[PDB]
Amino acid sequence: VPLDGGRFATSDLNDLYRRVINRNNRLKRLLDLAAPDIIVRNEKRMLQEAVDALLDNGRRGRAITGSNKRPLKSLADMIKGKQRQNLLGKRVDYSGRSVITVGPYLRLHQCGLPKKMALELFKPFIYGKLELRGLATTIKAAKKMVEREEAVVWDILDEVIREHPVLLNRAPTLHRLGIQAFEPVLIEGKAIQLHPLVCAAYNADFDGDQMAVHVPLTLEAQLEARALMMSTNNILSPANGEPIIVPS
Amino acid sequence: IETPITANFREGLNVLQYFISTHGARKGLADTALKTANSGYLTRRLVDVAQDLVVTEDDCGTHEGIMMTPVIEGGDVKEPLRDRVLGRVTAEDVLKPGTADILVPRNTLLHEQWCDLLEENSVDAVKVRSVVSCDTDFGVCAHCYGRDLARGHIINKGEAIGVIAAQSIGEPGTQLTTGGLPRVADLFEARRPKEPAIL
Amino acid sequence: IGLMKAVDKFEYRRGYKFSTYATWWIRQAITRSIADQARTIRIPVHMIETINKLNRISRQMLQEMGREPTPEELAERMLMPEDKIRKVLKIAKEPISMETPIGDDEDSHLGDFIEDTTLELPLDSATTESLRAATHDVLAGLTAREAKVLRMR
Amino acid sequence: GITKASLATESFISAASFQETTRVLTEAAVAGKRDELRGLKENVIVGRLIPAGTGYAYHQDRMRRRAAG
Amino acid sequence: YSYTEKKRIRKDFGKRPQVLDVPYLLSIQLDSFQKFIEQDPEGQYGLEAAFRSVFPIQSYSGNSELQYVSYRLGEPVFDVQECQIRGVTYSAPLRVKLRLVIYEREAPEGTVKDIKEQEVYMGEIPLMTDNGTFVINGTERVIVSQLHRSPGVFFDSDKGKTHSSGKVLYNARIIPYRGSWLDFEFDPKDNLFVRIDRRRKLPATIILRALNYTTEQILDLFFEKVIFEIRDNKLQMELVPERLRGETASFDIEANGKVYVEKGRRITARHIRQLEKDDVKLIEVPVEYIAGKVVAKDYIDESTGELICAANMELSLDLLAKLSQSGHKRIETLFTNDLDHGPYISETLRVDPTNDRLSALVEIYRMMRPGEPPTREAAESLFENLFFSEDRYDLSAVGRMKFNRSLLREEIEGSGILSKDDIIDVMKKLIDIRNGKGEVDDIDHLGNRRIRSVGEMAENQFRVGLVRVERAVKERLSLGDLDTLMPQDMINAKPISAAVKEFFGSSQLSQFMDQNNPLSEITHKRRISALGPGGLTRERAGFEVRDVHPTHYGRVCPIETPEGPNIGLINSLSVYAQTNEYGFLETPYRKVTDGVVTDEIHYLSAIEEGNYVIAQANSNLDEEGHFVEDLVTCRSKGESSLFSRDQVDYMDVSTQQVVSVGASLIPFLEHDDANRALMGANMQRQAVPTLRADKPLVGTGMERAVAVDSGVTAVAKRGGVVQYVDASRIVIKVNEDEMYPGEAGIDIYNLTKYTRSNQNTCINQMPCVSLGEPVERGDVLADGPSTDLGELALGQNMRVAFMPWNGYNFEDSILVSERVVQEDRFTTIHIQELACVSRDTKLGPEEITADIPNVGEAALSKLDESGIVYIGAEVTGGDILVGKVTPKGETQLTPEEKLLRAIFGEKASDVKDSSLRVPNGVSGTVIDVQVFTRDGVEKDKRALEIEEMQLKQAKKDLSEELQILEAGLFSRIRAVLVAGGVEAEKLDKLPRDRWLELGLTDEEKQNQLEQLAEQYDELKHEFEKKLEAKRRKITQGDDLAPGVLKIVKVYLAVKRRIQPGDKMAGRHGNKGVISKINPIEDMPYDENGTPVDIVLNPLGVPSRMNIGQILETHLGMAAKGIGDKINAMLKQQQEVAKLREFIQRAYDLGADVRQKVDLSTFSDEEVMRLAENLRKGMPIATPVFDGAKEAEIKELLKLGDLPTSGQIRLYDGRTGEQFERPVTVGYMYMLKLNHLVDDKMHARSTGSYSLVTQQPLGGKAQFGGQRFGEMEVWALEAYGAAYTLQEMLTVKSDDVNGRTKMYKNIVDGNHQMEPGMPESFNVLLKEIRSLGINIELEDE
């Protein structure tokens, strides 16, 4: 692939295959030129090496990459993907995050969500909802309305937000309480407001901790967050019958 | 160190007092970091071994179960009997101090009014159904597991008890201290000790 | 292989020593080969000479200038359009490794940041399906003779 | 030991995730193993519902239908 | 008291007097660099030592030699500012003189022609700022000092764990400064081994055999010989009486018609004394005794000419008979004593495969270079270039001295390579320690860990640049031409420039200066690191080296070290601590001759210190210098207890020498728990500089020295009076005494204004002196960011109350009154650099043009004719800053679109909008625009307008300086001509320039005037020589990278207020995120009606035992109290005496303190200035471990009419009613750390996706998505969220089709997902199928 400045970048396979291809053709040629046994064996030996390096560089002398000192990555190494090994884990859409602060007013089942975040998150819901209510002509039309942050969209947003809960996650996810669902209450600010009783499970303070938020798109998922992951359902701990939602 | 920090924090700690205070602190911090890293490595290995373990059967109907008694260490009890039985289903019907009268029938789930009934009576030993005992092939029977949930009822079909089990163990693992988190690691890993005893 | 050819074209009767005659043929097959397979993106022979030549002019002017020559300085030494140098320098680079680890020494590699530009956005994919629906409502509103004729043009 | 216990698995997909991948993969291949799925991780990788929970309802239906009529 | 001091004196507490003050904090950096770049006329480290090492470079016996003369550094191309503005490096070019000599063949050292080639250029080397930073590419950067193992020899153990037997083995390592390692180690069976570097193990006699030692001679080296004689017939033994210690007798040991020890009795200290006094030298022994005794040298039968026995071979009873009948009178055995003199070398010889000198050489070659065929030239040349060649090996003096010191030699300096003796003696030592006598040295100890910094590290890199050029010269002198080439043709500056640039650029020890704070700067420069080259990695070590060592005391700080994964690998340097001449850390001490404490300072190494007994700083001594108590607490050898009066050899310099500068700035430290201290000390650094510099009421006393030494502030060079002040510049009319005879002088100081910092904050200066003020040498002329009148001001003091306020201070969250957000006092300014790049693509070039497609007039209206936004224009998110367009024609549109193009009939664009626009959310004021065009490419309208304004601006500053300088010279002349020829009115009536034409009578005054005239024209000439250069730099085409036609950098200044989500903290490790901003009314208020600024939770104090934060709050209350009393008197306008009395009362409070005060200070003009400066509160200093006691605080509270409690009754602003119990209130210095929520918040609906893995990726302002890991997957698995999991890592990520099919449904109003397969797997399939494996998807 091209880059900026006219620079080019490539996967290390291309280097390796090139070696197979070249040594394979050099040999095809020597068979008709009637080379002496010493050379064809030598070439037959080299071809073995290039192939072995393509598939699993490492079980031999380990060929190093073009100019760069570092050795090239062979097919078998792309099959793993974790150099013990790395945990994770993939990146997801409809998701955000920020610093968390308090929020004593909340009920157990709700959470505080910045106005701005909410907007950018539910964007597609909002777009359809405008043109389903005839405020926007087309989709392109809604695109711009929400860009302008017209007073009418703030009303529409309260609608797509009503019975639609979000999920909130904290740094290490030890037990399943690491992710819990909340009904979103709209907030002016840029801070996520969390219920004080739930802090315990999450192991959250307000010493600068941060949490992420996820939107359950499909319907089944909305319900799965209302019936299983909803803050109110997880009142007791699954490690021992005693309640985790404890006055702090 | 033989001479301890005689002063406190309302008082001032002098130079040699602080300097010595330091090591304890620095070791502490490092120690928590490592104990955080190791608690997760366990859980990872734990979830690996469980994972696929799901509540499949409704009731495998075996009578085989383990025998529950209060822990009782040394002089007096370290953890009482009520806690160990609560929420577990009974393997066979237990009786009062005098027989002929069964207080609780064959496989009844022992809850709060039952435990209070088994505390009203001097009952001290109970045989209970366990996942280790459960016949069920490829899964665990609903009855054998018990109930515990964030819901107060018996466990439902299809819940991945395995994963939830794992999580439960390594999560508070950060708090732990032969012994400590590494001892726990050794137990699960089933390691033979240096000088073993033959029977 | 450059040897394997010196042996066929050899004539001992010319009294030429085989130890130097082949030296030309072996040295010929080696340097011709580097020209074809040493590069990921193959460039022609006249292009490699051009390149090497410029590193010779740069050497001369390196401490000669006190710092280093301007892109349009070497341009003057050279018979060619002299701007071509910019094009030459750009092609002559050779691709950088996609698996080159970037900062924090993390498993984060170069390729992980190359975004896909060929793709079509979802926000866009919708407006198009929507433009289909909108032009239809408009076409059906017209007279049938007019719609069929428009859809043809 | 759990670490050894986790090693035995019917599902070569699930195996390749944590064990040594070359080894798992080599051995499965010679054998001509067939992963029937039925397990948590293996379905996640391949991308279908989990054989537990909500998905439990569906997976139970797919299993009986398999090798039936 | 000095002119800046006189304005605001901070009241100091604490008894102890400072005998030694804080030395120039940034010394380590500035001293280091100096030695590297200094012209030294000896072999001491530096560029000179660098050249001398690799030179001369002589041809392979070709007798053509290139030799080094001398180097030079030409003045830089650009100054520091130009460097940062343009964006290049600040370096001086290296011009070195080289001599090429060609020798005659064949004459004994006769030279043909020699060319003394002029100074050839071999690269530029970047230069250090007065602050110790390097500008690398227009960015200030710091090179962190390294802490590594000192070179030489060190012996270790590795007890117990080695093989689990218990035994403990012993290793010896010979680590040089450059060259291979040589290891000597014991195996379990007591045999000695060796390994070069970490390679294969070999028996230790092989290396001696390689040095030309025969079996006979090696046994001759290590062991003592025991002589056996066969006088008359059958045996006799030469005896030394001491030899028989730790042995039980085997036979009847009788001598001289007397029996000393009977058969089977242990020879003890008694049998040894008796034989010793008697003088017994020969005793008779039996034949059977030498059945195991090993023979030392070979023995042969003379007659046959055959070998009876070889050296190091056990004797048998038949063998004894053989050498005796062959007529051998003596035998040489070994003295093998199991406990004392073990036969370890004797048993190793038996393991040894080799037999001679070559055999050894071959074996060692075969280990080092295995597989390849060993030659003779090779094996010999390899062994010599391992430890004996000056090129490939150098112990360095540091190492040489340490090496000799460990073997206990008389010397301190020797060679750089190992002698035969060096290797032998090292062995001889390692063997003593196994036998007994000898202790192994621990690594952790700071006498074995050495410290390296910038200068030396770079000298090391320049050597590597030379060794590789050495290769080019040798390669060239090979094909040698005669007097045609010159040393210039062959020396290539690029690899030299490349290597130095890499070191300063990409290096672990080089990084961007922590520039968000003046502590951040100063602490960064003083950072130590065990990391990098020649240092361990996080994963390799090893809690033993991380931890606090006793030798750390007063050398490194026990607390300032990171919480992260590298705790204890970093550390910050102790205040008074310096770098030793050989490179060790030494801390200063007071000499105690007999019983009196001198005022003489002695600096001590980690080992010097170990011997002496040192008295605590925390000691009591009076009068001449006598200790008050007979018993004083002292530390001696690693431990500390109570000691005798006349016994101490030394005493600590200060209460603060154990901590670091960042630690010395935490008040009442003593009252904080080390765990929380560490965090605050780290947190102080992350403080962003406020809009208005406050100054702490509660300080410690460093605050000033910290601000001065860091160059954020502007300090006096010479002292005089202020001629002109201006937000722009300050000019000082120098005092005659400090002045220089010629060229008069008036110092002009130019202030740094509203510019960007490395952490995108705002680094700006301000004039603190006003017109016509007398200044002293070393006073602050201007303040810098987060500095108030000379003192360090990272934050601002707040009125604080401790109480739970309905849960708005639940975890650590903080509650703040609007009054703080109104006063704009925690407001902070941020500056951003945003560049638009105009490049060349294959489709054509990119245009920076005002004409952009699909944009409303209103959008374009913010741009100038060229397409570049106007300076001063207030912009918001989305607004176009630089209009750019990228060529892209032949779109190929759809038929529905084609219809639309006929209807509205719009012309389609062959260009794409690539303009730079304000990132979403951010909003500020454009404050500068810089254009950089490629040379040769035509400058646009805006580009030139800027060049013009600059030239004008350049000519103005230049001329104005010259103008002030002219008057300064001419004023000096008027005073010189009047002192001997006064014409006070007669003089100024003629033109000022025609004065130079007047002479004077016979004096040096005639010479002084001559000097001023001379300096007058050098100024005239320099002004013109500068204006030329400045003009050139403005006009000249900035060199741009490939592809790029031109670049537009816009600088945006955003004013960020303070909101919920922002992080705040105090100096005592108390974190906190502001929770809710509240109305003024609702605030808890006291009886006077004055509300609290910030409400804090009291629960964060018992748990996190940082108790000093409370004392901050009480002493802060007392502090502000004194100010209120003064503000009261100031408002009533009492009088000079009334204010004097109270103030003098205040600076005396506490009893027996070191403060001191007036009356000397001038009743008027002076006292009133101080008064006004105190009305905001009275600044107080609490030394670190010499702090102010509870009592002193309570009395200062009494003096402000405040309660001793420190507690007041308060009322809720909401209900008006009283809170039961009194709550603590007072003032606490609080910071704003740059973790602002504005930066932290992120969100994404749909967006961009990566090329390989079709996975969310951010680029076009719009950030990537959040990472949903395995861990979280388990979470959903634990619930029943099967659909939540499916949509999560299918449609919301890798599913290239489903992802859009979803988005389409959502807008259509359908909550359905159509799953399908993720790419992540789909790819795996192709990847393994491209191995020979077939994977398939089975069944229906």
Ligand SMILES: Cc1noc(C)c1S(=O)(=O)Nc1c(N2CCC(NCc3ccc(C(F)(F)F)cc3)CC2)c(=O)c1=O
């Ligand atoms: C998220 C997440 N958290 O846990 C899970 C699991 C997920 S995932 O379902 O999205 N799967 C995911 C990934 N790959 C790629 C690497 C591959 N591991 C080795 C392997 C297994 C099976 C074979 C076979 F047998 F199929 F050939 C070959 C190689 C596993 C699958 C990622 O990366 C990644 O993020």
Ligand SMILES: [Mg+2]
């Ligand atoms: Mg926290």
Ligand SMILES: [Zn+2]
């Ligand atoms: Zn069961």
